[PDB]
Amino acid sequence: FLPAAAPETDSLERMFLDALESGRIPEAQRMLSALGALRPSFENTAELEDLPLPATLAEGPGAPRLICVSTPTANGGVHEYARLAASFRGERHVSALPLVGFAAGERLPATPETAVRVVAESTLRASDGNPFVLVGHSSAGAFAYLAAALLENTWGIRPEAVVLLDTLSLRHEQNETIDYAGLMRRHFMVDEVSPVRMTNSRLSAMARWMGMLNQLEVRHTTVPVLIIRAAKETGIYGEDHGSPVDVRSVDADHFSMVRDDAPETARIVKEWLDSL
Amino acid sequence: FLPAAAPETDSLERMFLDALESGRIPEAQRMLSALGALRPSFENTAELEDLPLPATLAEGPGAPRLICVSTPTANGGVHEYARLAASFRGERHVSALPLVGFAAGERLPATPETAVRVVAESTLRASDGNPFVLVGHSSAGAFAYLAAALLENTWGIRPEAVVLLDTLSLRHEQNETIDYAGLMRRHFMVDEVSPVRMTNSRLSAMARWMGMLNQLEVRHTTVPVLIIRAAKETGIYGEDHGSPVDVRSVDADHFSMVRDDAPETARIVKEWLDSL
Numbered sequence: 324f325l326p327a328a329a330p331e332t333d334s335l336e337r338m339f340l341d342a343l344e345s346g347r348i349p350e351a352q353r354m355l356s357a358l359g360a361l362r363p364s365f366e367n368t369a370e371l372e373d374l375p376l377p378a379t380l381a382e383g384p385g386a387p388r389l390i391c392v393s394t395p396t397a398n399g400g401v402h403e404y405a406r407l408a409a410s411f412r413g414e415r416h417v418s419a420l421p422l423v424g425f426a427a428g429e430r431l432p433a434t435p436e437t438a439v440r441v442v443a444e445s446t447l448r449a450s451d452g453n454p455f456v457l458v459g460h461s462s463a464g465a466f467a468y469l470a471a472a473l474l475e476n477t478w479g480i481r482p483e484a485v486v487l488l489d490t491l492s493l494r495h496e497q498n499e500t501i502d503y504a505g506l507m508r509r510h511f512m513v514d515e516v517s518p519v520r521m522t523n524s525r526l527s528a529m530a531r532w533m534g535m536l537n538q539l540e541v542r543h544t545t546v547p548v549l550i551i552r553a554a555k556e557t558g559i560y561g562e563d564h565g566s567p568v569d570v571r572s573v574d575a576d577h578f579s580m581v582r583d584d585a586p587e588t589a590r591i592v593k594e595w596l597d598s599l
Numbered sequence: 600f601l602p603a604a605a606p607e608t609d610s611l612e613r614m615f616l617d618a619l620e621s622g623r624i625p626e627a628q629r630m631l632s633a634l635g636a637l638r639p640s641f642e643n644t645a646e647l648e649d650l651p652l653p654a655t656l657a658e659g660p661g662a663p664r665l666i667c668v669s670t671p672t673a674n675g676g677v678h679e680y681a682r683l684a685a686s687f688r689g690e691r692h693v694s695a696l697p698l699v700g701f702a703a704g705e706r707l708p709a710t711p712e713t714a715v716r717v718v719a720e721s722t723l724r725a726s727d728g729n730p731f732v733l734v735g736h737s738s739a740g741a742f743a744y745l746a747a748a749l750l751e752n753t754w755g756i757r758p759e760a761v762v763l764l765d766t767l768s769l770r771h772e773q774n775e776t777i778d779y780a781g782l783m784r785r786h787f788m789v790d791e792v793s794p795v796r797m798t799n800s801r802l803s804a805m806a807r808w809m810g811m812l813n814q815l816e817v818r819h820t821t822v823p824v825l826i827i828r829a830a831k832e833t834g835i836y837g838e839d840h841g842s843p844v845d846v847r848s849v850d851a852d853h854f855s856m857v858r859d860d861a862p863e864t865a866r867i868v869k870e871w872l873d874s875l
C-alpha cells in the first residue's frame with residue numbers, strides 16, 4: 324500500500340516517463356535497448372547463486388495451486404498479483420515469481436531459452452512437488468506457456484493448466500496487429516501507487532526481457548490452457564489444435580482485469596479450474 | 600579536495616564506467632546517445648533564465664584575464680582549471696565556465712550554433728568589460744576558438760587571444776587520425792578525486808555536447824592563438840594562415856598538462872601572453 328519514493332529529476336525513470344507522456348516512444352525504446360545491452364548476462368541457471376524466490380500471496384486448503392509469473396515490466400513484480408490473490412484467500416495457495424535481473428546486480432539471461440528455463444525452474448521451486456497452474460498476465464503469459472512446455476519436454480513435468488490473462492501474443496512481434504506503443508504508454512500512465520521505483524536495473528531488465536520476446540522458441544504444451552480475454556479492447560482453437568484451449572471473456576480492460584475487475588477474473592478462473 | 604559520493608551499483612555512472620573498463624566503447628556510446636536524445640533543448644539563449652555562471656579561480660592585478668571553458672565531459676566543470684589557476688594566484692584573474700545542460704533540469708542547446716553562442720555570451724558575462732583570453736582544454740578548446748570567432752563576427756568583440764590546451768581538432772570527426780575511443784577510456788580511467796558524480800544529467804549532457812562537435816560551423820578568428828601541445832602522445836601554420844597561430848610543446852600528456860605538469864603549462868602560457 325505504501326508508495327515507493329517518487330522519481331528524482333535526473334532519474335532514468337523520470338526521463339523515461341516524460342518521454343512516454345510526450346509520445347516519444349521510439350526514443351524511449353532505443354534508450355532502454357542501449358541501456359539493456361550493457362547489462363551482464365548468464366547462460367546457465369547453474370551460474371546463478373540462487374534462483375528467484377517466490378512470494379506467497381494467499382494460502383489455502385487446495386486444488387491445484389496457482390503460481391503467477393511477473394510481467395517483464397520495470398514496475399513489475401510479485402505485487403502485481405496481490406489483488407488477484409485476494410480473491411483466493413483461504414481457498415488455495417497463490418505464489419508469484421520475480422524475474423531474474425530486475426534486482427540490482429542480478430545478471431540477465433543471455434538467451435530466450437535461458438529466460439524460459441529460469442522461469443521454469445523457479446516455477447518448480449515454487450510448486451514444492453505439488454500440482455500447479457502457471458498464470459501470467461500479458462507477456463508474462465507467454466513466458467508461462469512456454470515454461471509449461473519446457474517442463475513437459477525436458478523434465479516430463481506437467482502443469483495442471485496454464486492461465487493467460489489477456490496475453491496478446493507469444494513473440495510480440497512488432498507488426499501492426501496491435502498498438503504495442505500505445506499499450507506501453509497506457510501501462511506506465513496507469514495511476515496507482517507502486518511499491519517499487521523503476522530503478523536503472525529494472526528498466527534495463529525490462530528492455531532485455533521484452534527484447535527477447537521476438538526471438539523465443541515457440542513450443543506446444545499439451546496441458547489445458549485458459550485465455551481470459553479482456554472485452555473492453557476488442558473460433559481459432561478446436562479439435563485440430565491437439566490439446567484443449569479455452570477462451571473466456573471478462574468485462575474489463577487489459578489493466579483493470581488484475582486491478583478493479585480482478586474478482587471477476589478470479590471467479591472465471593475458479594469456474595474453469597474445477598470444470599477440468 | 601572532498602570526494603563526491605561513489606557511484607551506486609545501479610547507477611548509470613557505474614554501468615558506464617564498467618563498460619569502458621571492459622573495452623565496450625561503442626555500446627557505452629550508443630547508450631549515451633540514446634539517453635542524450637531524450638533531453639530537452641533550447642534554441643535561443645533568451646529562452647534561458649540565466650546564463651551559466653562563472654567561478655573565479657584566481658584573482659590578480661592583471662594583464663589580460665583568463666576565462667576557461669569547461670570540457671564537455673560528464674565529470675567536467677569549473678574544477679577542471681583549478682590547478683592551472685593555482686599557478687596564476689595573485690597575478691591575474693582566472694574564471695571558468697560551466698556548460699549549460701550538465702546541471703539537472705537545464706536544457707541542452709538544440710544546435711551547435713546555439714552551443715557556441717551560449718559559450719560566447721557566458722564568456723562575455725565573465726569578461727565584465729575587461730580584455731580576456733579564452734582558454735579551453737581538449738575539446739573545450741574547439742568551443743573556445745569558435746566562440747572567439749562568433750564574438751568577432753556578430754558583436755565585433757575580440758579576445759586578446761585564445762589558448763588551446765592540447766586541443767586535437769575542432770569537429771573531432773571520427774576518422775582514424777586519433778584514437779578517440781582510447782582517449783575516452785583514458786579520461787574516465789584517470790585516478791583522482793572528483794568533486795562531482797557523473798549524474799544522468801551530466802552523462803546525457805556529455806553525449807549531446809560531444810555529439811555536436813561533428814556538426815560545428817567552422818569559422819576563423821583573427822585573434823592570436825596558442826596551441827600548447829602535449830609531447831608524450833606525439834609547419835602547418837605560417838604567413839598564409841591570415842593570423843598568428845603559435846604551437847608550443849610541453850613535457851606532459853593530455854591529462855597531466857592540467858594536473859601535475861600544470862605549472863609548466865601555466866608558465867608556457869605566461870611567457871607567450873606577455874610576448875604579444
Ligand SMILES: C[C@H]1[C@@H]2C[C@@H](O)/C=C/C=C/C=C/C=C/C[C@@H](C)OC(=O)C[C@H](O)/C=C/C[C@H](O)C[C@](O)(C[C@@H]1O)O2
Binds near residue numbers: 356530
Ligand atoms: C530491442 C528490442 C526492444 C527492447 C526495447 O527497445 C523495448 C522495450 C519495450 C518495452 C515495452 C514495455 C511495455 C509494457 C506494457 C505491457 C502491457 O506490454 C507487454 O507486456 C508486452 C509488450 O507489449 C511487448 C514488448 C515487445 C518489445 O517491444 C519488442 C522489442 O521492441 C524488440 C526489440 O528487439 O523490444
Ligand SMILES: C[C@H]1[C@@H]2C[C@@H](O)/C=C/C=C/C=C/C=C/C[C@@H](C)OC(=O)C[C@H](O)/C=C/C[C@H](O)C[C@](O)(C[C@@H]1O)O2
Binds near residue numbers: 628671806809
Ligand atoms: C552520437 C554522437 C556521439 C555522442 C555519443 O555517442 C558519444 C559520446 C562520446 C563521449 C566521449 C567522451 C570523451 C572524453 C575524453 C575527452 C578527452 O575527449 C574529448 O574531449 C573530445 C572527444 O574525444 C570527442 C568526442 C566526439 C564524439 O565521439 C562524436 C560522436 O561520436 C558523434 C556522434 O554523432 O558523439
